[PDB]
RNA sequence: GUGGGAGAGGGUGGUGGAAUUCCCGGAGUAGCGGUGAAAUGCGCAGAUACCGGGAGGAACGCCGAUGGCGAAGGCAGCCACCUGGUCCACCCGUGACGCUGAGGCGCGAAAGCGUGGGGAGCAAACCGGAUUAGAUACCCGGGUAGUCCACGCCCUAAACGAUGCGCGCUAGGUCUCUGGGUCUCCUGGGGGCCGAAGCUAACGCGUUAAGCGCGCCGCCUGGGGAGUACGGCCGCAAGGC
């Protein structure tokens, strides 16, 4: 069920196609670099459809990680 | 004519001396390129999510420009040439979609 | 012998075997282990069990260049690897952090006919 | 591509009158404009044949309208292609 | 037509990171690998596991869906260029210019063929190890064609919704993708589910019809023999119609 707490309330205003605001779209991904599901992101069908491109052109700018290892276990 | 965003990123490690050698090519080449700066943002170097050609920062850039189609490809081509240049990333402008507004 | 004190221990865990290996902060091997450095032989060195021994046969070998805490990094998925885990931590060797490192593609090659309906 | 100063420039250079926007001379021109453009894409990057259905659709629109014009008014039919540069 | 929109629709070029393999360097030692259990295999010419550097091929994790695009086959990292389809609003222009479509032409997964290139991983055949009563298999270790690219062929399929295309008519409820609006809701296009009437042998279908109707095309007429034989046409061949 997930109800911790969809990181587009846990924010405000911004701007889903702006690929070098690192401190904003750094919210949108897992403990490992991963794209976090419409589930976690509350974002919708077209949000989360922009919102991927633009992270990923982030990734290519090295602003944002492809992949992540994950702490403890 | 369109309008665009040029993205690059150069070796952290420049003195003040060859970082200003790079953006003279950077601007040597935009207009043999049709292309008219509308504006920059040197962002200056910053921490990589991961390391670029060695280095685990790199020194960035931003040119909104306006230039001719047929030659964004051919421009990229050039831009990449130099070797401080380890990123180049050009795209079609595109108007705010914001969010939770 | 050089007297490393503080490294790492990698645990590479697979449904055939678990194999560990010390390194110092740079990630140079210092001493190693493994179901078969221990005396198991066939399907034995993947049993939770073998782990727990190659993990302290490991961690043992590497007192002897005086170590004494590491930084666990976990790799693969298979039976034996939290007992390795488990077994380093309850072993002299202070276990400041674990973390999970297995490697996995973004697709890229075909996996062999057995691990397929997948890629 | 196309803007929208050029297809200006050709619903002008077209029109019957001012203000002709869907006439079979207006259409017949804009097709043809599209259909020369495409042509020229596809002599290059000619494995493109999802475009080329395009085209053929294209070709065949035209034809029905200048069809429909050879059969009301054979005149403005003659005029039309010699003014554009069809048939072949 | 004008103004807006969404999309893995197509083509060309460029480019990013993960991983596998190989090569080089370091560090380190007796095994690794693999299975039901094993063995073949690989390793003291130092493998496996670990760190650093390099090369190359192929494929794009998360997002990702119950989602989207396309006429079908099919299409998924990201960037630019070239290019197709399509939906909505405004009622602006033409004035029945329409539907269907034998033949023709084009497209058409995979495998396969020809020429040239490439070859990391995978893997028909094949070489071995196990298993079995046997095992020309299933399991394990190898491995050539091929899988990749270009250009040219081939033209098949459970090429499926097993449901030809178009138009009008006949309760609703609910989820969803994309657009417009006076934005609890309404209205248009698409994707699902449950269902009125009705239809159906039944199963089921049901405004995304398999209902009620009109138009045009394709096709069926018991099973085996047989998608064979013959002929014709097509193909380099395999072989297709
Ligand atoms: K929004
Ligand atoms: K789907
Ligand atoms: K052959
Ligand atoms: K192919
Ligand atoms: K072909
Ligand atoms: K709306
Ligand atoms: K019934
Ligand atoms: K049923
Ligand atoms: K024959
Ligand atoms: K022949
Ligand atoms: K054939
Ligand atoms: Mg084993
Ligand atoms: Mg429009
Ligand atoms: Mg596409
Ligand atoms: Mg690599
Ligand atoms: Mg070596
Ligand atoms: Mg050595
Ligand atoms: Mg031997
Ligand atoms: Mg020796
Ligand atoms: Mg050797
Ligand atoms: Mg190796
Ligand atoms: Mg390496
Ligand atoms: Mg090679
Ligand atoms: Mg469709
Ligand atoms: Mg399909
Ligand atoms: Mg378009
Ligand atoms: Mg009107
Ligand atoms: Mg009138
Ligand atoms: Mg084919
Ligand atoms: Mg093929
Ligand atoms: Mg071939
Ligand atoms: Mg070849
Ligand atoms: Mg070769
Ligand atoms: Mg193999
Ligand atoms: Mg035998
Ligand atoms: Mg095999
Ligand atoms: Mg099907
Ligand atoms: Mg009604
Ligand atoms: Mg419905
Ligand atoms: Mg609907
Ligand atoms: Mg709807
Ligand atoms: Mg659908
Ligand atoms: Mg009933
Ligand atoms: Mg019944
Ligand atoms: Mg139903
Ligand atoms: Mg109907
Ligand atoms: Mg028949
Ligand atoms: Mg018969
Ligand atoms: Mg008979
Ligand atoms: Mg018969
Ligand atoms: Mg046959
Ligand atoms: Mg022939």
Known sequence: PSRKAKVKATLGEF?????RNVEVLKRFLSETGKILPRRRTGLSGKEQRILAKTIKRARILGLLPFTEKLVRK | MRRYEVNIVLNPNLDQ??????????????????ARVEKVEELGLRRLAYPIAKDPQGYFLWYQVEMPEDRVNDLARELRIRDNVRRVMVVKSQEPFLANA | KRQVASGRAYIHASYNNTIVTITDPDGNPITWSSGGVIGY????????????????????????????????????????????????????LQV???????????NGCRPKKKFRKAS | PITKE??????????????????????????TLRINRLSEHLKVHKKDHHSHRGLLMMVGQRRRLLRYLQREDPERYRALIEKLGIRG
Do not use: C, W
């Not at chain 3, 190659?54 to 805490?69: E, F, N, R, T």
């Not at chain 3, 400041?96 to 973004?106: C, F």
């Open chain 2, 17 to 34: 001396s060859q970082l200003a050698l790079e953006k003279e090519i950077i601007q040597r080449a935009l207009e043999n390129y049709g």
């Open chain 3, 41 to 92: 032989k066939g399907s034995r060195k993947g049993t939770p069990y073998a782990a727990q021994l190659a993990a302290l046969d490991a961690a043992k070998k590497a007192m002897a260049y005086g170590m004494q805490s590491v930084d666990v990094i976990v790799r693969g998925t298979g039976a034996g690897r939290e007992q390795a885990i488990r077994a380093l931590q309850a072993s002299g």
């Open chain 4, 6 to 31: 050029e297809k200006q420039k050709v619903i002008q250079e077209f029109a019957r009158f001012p203000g002709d926007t869907g006439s079979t001379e207006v259409q017949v021109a804009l097709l």
């Open chain 3, 96 to 106: 400041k952090s674990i973390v999970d490192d297995t490697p996995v593609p973004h």
């Open chain 1, 15 to 19: 701007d889903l196609r702006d690929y």
